[PDB]
Amino acid sequence: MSKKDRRRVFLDVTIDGNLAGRIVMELYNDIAPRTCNNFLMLCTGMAGTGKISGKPLHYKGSTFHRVIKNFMIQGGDFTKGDGTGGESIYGGMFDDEEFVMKHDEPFVVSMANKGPNTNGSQFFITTTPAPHLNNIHVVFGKVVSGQEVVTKIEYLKTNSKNRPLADVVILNCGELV
């Protein structure tokens, strides 16, 4: 493994248009190379267009559509915006790499899915240990800066389906080379 191979990405968020801060994450390409590559290519959007979706493979413009207090925030659905869409750069969904990293710490980044090998683009950031997710969800990165923006988003008022009343937008994203 090489810590040198670990890349960095960011998510500039806005809540109802107001600047909320930047989230900087460290991806672990030395432990989840396939997964992390998906994430970074999605932040920079340099992977083109969805083979199935058709829409651009880019988190930019997508939202954080679901949030749970004392738990996590979820987003990355850039094709439906409701949690039923999203697509990886590899065309459609891709497989679960070795579940090496766990949700034994707060603020780790993980892949949201709908069962085995169903990784699309949707991901979540926890704000608490979520061991009941270990081995079921692939943990690829970790927040190293701006964990307060996550906390700010997590406690936003939501509707009955846990969607934030305000529009939480990833106004911009990319890599920190």
């Binding site: 996590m72 949690g83 039923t84 899915n113 709908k114 169903t118």
Partner: peptide, 11 residues
């Protein structure tokens, strides 16, 4: 409850 899925959301 506390799950993070894409499509079939549970409690």
């Amino acid at each position: 409850x506390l799950l993070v899925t894409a499509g079939l959301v549970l409690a």
